[PDB]
Write a protein that binds this ligand. Structure first.
Ligand SMILES: NC(=O)c1ccc[n+]([C@@H]2O[C@H](COP(=O)([O-])OP(=O)(O)OC[C@H]3O[C@@H](n4cnc5c(N)ncnc54)[C@H](O)[C@@H]3O)[C@@H](O)[C@H]2O)c1
Ligand code: FES
Ligand SMILES: [K+]
Ligand SMILES: [K+]
Ligand SMILES: [K+]
Ligand SMILES: [K+]
Ligand SMILES: [K+]
Ligand SMILES: [K+]
Ligand SMILES: [K+]
Ligand SMILES: [K+]
Ligand SMILES: [K+]
Ligand SMILES: [K+]
Ligand SMILES: [K+]
Ligand SMILES: [Mg+2]
Ligand SMILES: [Mg+2]
Ligand SMILES: [Mg+2]
Ligand SMILES: [Mg+2]
Ligand SMILES: [Mg+2]
Ligand SMILES: [Mg+2]
Ligand SMILES: [Mg+2]
Ligand SMILES: [Mg+2]
Ligand SMILES: [Mg+2]
Ligand SMILES: [Mg+2]
Ligand SMILES: [Mg+2]
Ligand SMILES: [Mg+2]
Ligand SMILES: [Mg+2]
Ligand SMILES: [Mg+2]
Ligand SMILES: [Mg+2]
Ligand SMILES: [Mg+2]
Ligand SMILES: [Mg+2]
Ligand SMILES: [Mg+2]
Ligand SMILES: [Mg+2]
Ligand SMILES: [Mg+2]
Ligand SMILES: [Mg+2]
Ligand SMILES: [Mg+2]
Ligand SMILES: [Mg+2]
Ligand SMILES: [Mg+2]
Ligand SMILES: [Mg+2]
Lengths: 215, 108, 51, 110, 43, 168
RNA sequence: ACAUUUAACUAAAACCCCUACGCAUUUAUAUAGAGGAGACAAGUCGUAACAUGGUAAGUGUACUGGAAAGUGCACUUGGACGAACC
RNA sequence: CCCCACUAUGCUUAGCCCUAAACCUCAACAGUUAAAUCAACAAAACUGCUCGCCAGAACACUACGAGCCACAGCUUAAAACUCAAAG
RNA sequence: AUAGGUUUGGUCCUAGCCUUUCUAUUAGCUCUUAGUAAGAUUACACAUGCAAGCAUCCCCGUUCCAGUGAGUUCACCCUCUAAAUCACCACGAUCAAAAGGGACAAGCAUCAAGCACGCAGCAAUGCAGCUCAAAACGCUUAGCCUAGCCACACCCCCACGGGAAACAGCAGUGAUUAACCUUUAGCAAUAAACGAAAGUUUAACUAAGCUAUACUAACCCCAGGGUUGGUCAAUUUCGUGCCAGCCACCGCGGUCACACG
């Protein structure tokens, strides 16, 4: 039952984990793109055809913040995909920015901020995702007040929906079997279920990162 | 034996089954080395046509060639099967007629 | 409840044990008295022989 | 209360007391022979922590499983000495007995 | 516990095995002071 | 013939006739009995006949036996809580001893029936699968459903070989 | 064997060691040569055994002899001693 | 094989060797003579319990390994080929 | 087993061997159709094509499925508690690692001793113990306990590093073995991956091709193979002359062979 130790399996494991931390690729290498073939030279993978247009016309977040005093702290940044989709003001209020110093133009890095999606401001600041996307736009200072003007519409929404055919019949049968005599209709309380949009910013802290294998 | 003795000894240990000349295989291929005859044991008398072949496993064995008349020669390939020749002591292999170089016996 | 009943049963059996042991001693004492009487005679007769 | 040791309560015979504060106990269980369908004793050795070193070779002991093994082989502790070797007290009457004879008659204390 | 003859080969091998253990125990202690000395030097 | 006196004891039928199924509290059972004396006859019969039946129904309970250690036979059970149940068996027959421990430490017939009913639910008649686990292997066995192709060939219209031939 | 640094108006950067294996150690296969065992219709020498087998047979052990075998010592009956007297 | 002569040896002392048809070929303990007693022969047939041992003949009181004051030894002890018998 | 043949001049007992039953591979000879199931001998070497993508960039996936059986008590139960799913902080549940306890193949004892295999103490350190004929320690063999599971993924147990250049993914080829399936189609069904999704991808899989290996149902035409002394169902006449040959066992053939052709 005494298992024979495998030392090389543990040695290489530590060496691999270490090298993944010392030779890790930077955002400048990972998220570079050849604008003629529209492929990431790091991996040589083609971008999706639906992204080709914006990659050529739109700017990344730190292609904008690299031109500002403190990388645009306390400045509002929106996204074209948000402007086209939602009428309500959607933006990040930048709070922290870790620029990638290896970029020749300081056009890569990370960013933190406070999200305000569709006029609902989040209570706490969290890391911004899609910072490497060609989608961001900087809000001029003189346009900030008008841009952020929002009136909350009435939240009147459906509170209860009927059970499907079979489930309803099975709940009414249990009532009669137990003896309870009532004519009320069983209904599902969907007020607790808050359906958020599919393009709502996800948690960047839980998102992974590309591995080092370069092409 | 007593119940205590039977428990301490356990079930009978099946004697290992012995592999015959074919090593538990239906047939073996071989190369003819020499062809000769052997005289059977009592009370029989004949000149039974046998040959020595080198089996694919590397062992060389004497194999009886059945039928009336054979054309086997050295450096020929034959298929051998089990089955002892009851007359010839120690000949436990038989050449298959109609396979590789060994042809079917000619009618009458 | 079952454990209490078991202890009660053991107590009842113990009372029967004491009664049985008391009777056995009475018989033991009687047998002992007879053995001692026989032994005393043997020793006396044997002591006289050596004297 | 939860313990990771498989055997929670086991009675055994003390077979060795040469380790410090550790009594070596032989525990026997009845195992069915599948062919003969007769029960034969199967014995296993258990190390039991004895803090007071009050265990003697040949005495019957009760071992309680420790919450976690204190040593590589010590997974139990001496819970109680059921029968002391040569100094047995009859549980039924509570009187000292040598074999099948009472050293003190149960009728002494009524 | 056991009733088995202690022949020469066993008796001789058991003597060495005890000697080897005694020689190894002493080495375990000579790798204790050397480690202690180095630790004291760091301070 | 089968070896030993009373060979019936070494039969699965006899071993399964024990009615004493200890509760989960019982962990150890020490049987102290004397080899001679008329007052210990029942304890000797109980060790000869009934210990095999008790162990068969309680495989994980340790039963240990001690000979001629005390003037009288007795049983002692060690429960998981730490309680010790001493049962004096002097003068009692092997049948009385067996009935006694069933009452004080044996599961009642209701408790056993319930456990057996829970096992019944493990095998679901409607489930299909190998015969080791289920009654039927495929729906094709149920009459009215399309039989298995191995027994009754399917129509050419329902076979993929000709489905694509009619289309092309 | 091997080092705690740089940095700190948001915060991060830096971190990467060498030692084995040899014609040694293990287990087999092949054999100059030397021997056994078994098998095998009609070879040679003697006749040891089976009848009291022509010295009853055999066991252990020792010595001796072309070969079976011979002899000593003890032991066995898996030999016999003819079963009233003469 | 028969006759004669004479050694080792048979004896004593002190150490080895550890074998036998060491077999009354019938294991130790307890109990039975009832019934089908019971293949044959031998020294009638059995019960309880326990340890030891045996599973066709030959190879084989052998080979190898291990132990032993044994070194031409003893103890433990196979396999391959062979036969349809051996007993 | 409902047993049978065979020791001998003969009888009884014991005993081995073989016969009769049912399956799987391979060989000879022979072979019409349909449906279904199953399908390299080899952990030996492999030409060529394909088998992992998805998607407004990030991520996620390629850690699965599929394959093989080299090695081999890592698989089961309990305790404890990661990761993962339940949108999300919960919640507890579900699922399930590492760690701890217990359990778990075969043959050989001509493998009988292993040689540090234990305990106490906060530590320092002290004690000398621990396993083993109820089989330790070893050698040999083998995937297993099959709704499936375990192990492996060219070799060096591992894989930083070396040898070196990898089909034990599908189809296919060489060598090798008694052992011999197509270098088809499609993502329509189900399953998996990805997407918010319409959808996209998949040699998983589905539907076909090949093969008496098996089962099932047919066939107006079209039947072969083995056997015929006894066990054991069934031989006429010739040739051969202990020759040629036959036999599972006992045996047959020496000039009248129901045993060979
Ligand atoms: N081998 C032991 O030292 C030993 C220890 C305890 C119990 N036993 C018991 O001894 C019997 C024989 O066991 P085995 O078949 O393994 O031995 P065995 O006959 O194969 O001999 C193996 C070893 O055990 C010894 N031995 C043999 N019989 C013995 C006995 N009765 N008592 C003690 N030692 C004995 C021998 O001297 C030898 O050294 C069994 O009942 C066993 O339980 C033996
Ligand atoms: S097994 Fe059910 S259709 Fe074939
Ligand atoms: K003849
Ligand atoms: K003949
Ligand atoms: K003679
Ligand atoms: K004679
Ligand atoms: K003897
Ligand atoms: K005798
Ligand atoms: K027979
Ligand atoms: K065929
Ligand atoms: K395997
Ligand atoms: K490997
Ligand atoms: K599909
Ligand atoms: Mg034949
Ligand atoms: Mg030679
Ligand atoms: Mg003579
Ligand atoms: Mg004579
Ligand atoms: Mg003589
Ligand atoms: Mg002479
Ligand atoms: Mg003299
Ligand atoms: Mg004298
Ligand atoms: Mg004598
Ligand atoms: Mg005896
Ligand atoms: Mg001898
Ligand atoms: Mg010898
Ligand atoms: Mg030798
Ligand atoms: Mg968690
Ligand atoms: Mg685990
Ligand atoms: Mg050997
Ligand atoms: Mg033995
Ligand atoms: Mg293997
Ligand atoms: Mg390969
Ligand atoms: Mg590997
Ligand atoms: Mg392939
Ligand atoms: Mg095939
Ligand atoms: Mg198909
Ligand atoms: Mg004729
Ligand atoms: Mg004929």
């Amino acid at each position: 039952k005494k298992v024979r130790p495998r030392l090389i399996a543990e040695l290489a494991r530590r060496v691999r984990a270490l090298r993944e931390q010392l030779n890790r690729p930077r955002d400048s290498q990972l998220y570079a793109v050849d604008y003629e073939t529209l492929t990431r030279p790091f991996s040589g993978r083609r971008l999706p055809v639906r992204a080709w247009a914006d990659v050529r016309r739109e700017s990344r977040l730190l292609q904008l913040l690299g031109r500002l005093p403190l990388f645009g702290l306390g400045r509002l940044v929106t996204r074209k995909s948000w402007l086209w989709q939602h009428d309500e003001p959607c933006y990040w209020r930048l709070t922290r920015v870790r620029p990638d110093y290896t970029a020749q133009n300081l056009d890569h890095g990370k960013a933190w901020g406070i999200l305000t999606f569709k006029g609902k401001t989040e209570s706490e600041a969290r890391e911004i995702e899609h910072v490497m996307y060609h989608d961001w736009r900087l809000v001029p200072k003189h346009e900030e007040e008008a841009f952020t003007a929002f009136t909350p519409a009435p939240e009147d929404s459906l509170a209860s929906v009927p059970y499907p055919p079979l489930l309803r019949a099975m709940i009414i049968a249990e009532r009669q079997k137990n003896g309870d005599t009532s004519t009320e209709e069983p209904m599902l309380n969907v007020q607790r279920i808050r359906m958020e949009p599919w393009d709502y910013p996800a948690k960047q802290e839980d998102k992974g990162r590309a591995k080092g294998t370069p092409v | 034996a007593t119940l205590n003795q039977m428990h301490r000894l356990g079930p009978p240990k099946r004697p290992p089954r012995k592999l015959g000349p074919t090593e538990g295989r239906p047939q073996l291929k071989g190369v003819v080395l020499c062809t000769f005859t052997r005289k059977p044991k009592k009370p029989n008398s004949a000149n039974r046509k046998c040959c020595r072949v080198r089996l694919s496993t590397g062992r060389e064995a004497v194999c009886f060639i059945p039928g009336e008349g054979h054309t086997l020669q050295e450096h020929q390939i034959v298929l051998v099967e089990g089955g002892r020749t009851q007359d010839l002591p120690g000949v436990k292999l038989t050449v298959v007629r109609g396979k590789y170089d060994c042809g079917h016996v000619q009618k009458k | 409840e079952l454990m209490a009943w078991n202890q009660a049963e053991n107590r009842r059996l113990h009372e029967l044990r004491i009664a049985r042991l008391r009777q056995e001693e009475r018989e033991q004492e009687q047998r002992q008295a007879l053995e001692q009487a026989r032994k005393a005679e043997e020793v006396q007769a044997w002591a006289q022989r050596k004297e | 209360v939860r313990s990771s040791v498989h055997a929670r309560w086991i009675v055994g015979k003390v077979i060795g007391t040469k380790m410090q504060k550790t009594a070596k106990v032989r525990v026997t269980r009845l195992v069915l022979d599948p062919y003969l369908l007769k029960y034969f004793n199967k014995r296993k050795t258990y190390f039991a922590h004895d803090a007071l070193q009050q265990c003697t070779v040949g005495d019957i002991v009760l071992l309680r499983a420790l919450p976690v093994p204190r040593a590589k082989h010590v997974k139990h502790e001496l819970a109680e000495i059921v029968f002391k070797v040569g100094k047995v007290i009859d549980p039924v009457t509570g009187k000292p007995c040598a074999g099948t004879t009472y050293l003190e008659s149960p009728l002494s204390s009524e | 516990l056991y009733y088995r003859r202690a022949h020469r080969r066993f008796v001789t091998k058991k003597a060495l095995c005890i000697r080897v253990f005694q020689e190894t125990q002493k080495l375990k202690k000579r790798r204790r002071a050397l480690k202690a000395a180095a630790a004291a030097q760091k301070q | 013939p089968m070896k030993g006196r009373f060979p019936i004891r070494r039969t699965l039928q006899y071993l399964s006739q024990g009615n004493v199924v200890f509760k989960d509290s019982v962990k150890v059972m020490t049987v102290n009995y004397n080899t001679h004396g008329e007052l210990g006859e029942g304890a000797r019969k109980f060790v000869f006949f009934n210990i095999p039946q008790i162990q068969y129904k309680n495989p994980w309970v340790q039963i240990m036996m001690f000979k001629n250690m005390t003037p009288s036979p007795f049983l002692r059970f060690y429960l998981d809580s730490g309680e010790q149940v001493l049962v004096d068996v002097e003068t009692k027959s092997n049948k009385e001893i067996m009935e006694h421990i069933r009452k004080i430490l044996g599961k009642n017939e209701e408790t056993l029936r319930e456990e057996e009913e829970e096992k019944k639910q493990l095998s679901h008649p409607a489930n299909f699968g190998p015969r080791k686990y289920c009654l039927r292997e495929c729906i094709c066995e149920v009459e009215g459903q399309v039989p298995c192709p191995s027994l009754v060939p399917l129509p050419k219209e329902m076979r993929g070989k000709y489905k694509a031939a009619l289309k092309a």
